[PDB]
Amino acid sequence: GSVEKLTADAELQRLKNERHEEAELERLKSEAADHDKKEAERKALEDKLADY
Numbered sequence: 340g341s342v343e344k345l346t347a348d349a350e351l352q353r354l355k356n357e358r359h360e361e362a363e364l365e366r367l368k369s370e371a372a373d374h375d376k377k378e379a380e381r382k383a384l385e386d387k388l389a390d391y
Contacts (some may be wrong), residue, residue, distance in 0.1 A: 342348050
């Protein structure tokens with residue numbers, strides 16, 4: 340594919356730097372943080388359908 344010859348995979352290498360041991364454990368804690376969207380529902384009451 341000569342992908343490495345085009346250095347097109349250079350962008351992929353940058354993503355690897357973002358990955359870390361903490362990131363792997365982040366998914367385990369993401370389970371409790373996945374309820375953040377539900378909390379946004381409470382804020383919807385503030386709109387009170389003001390925007391009709």
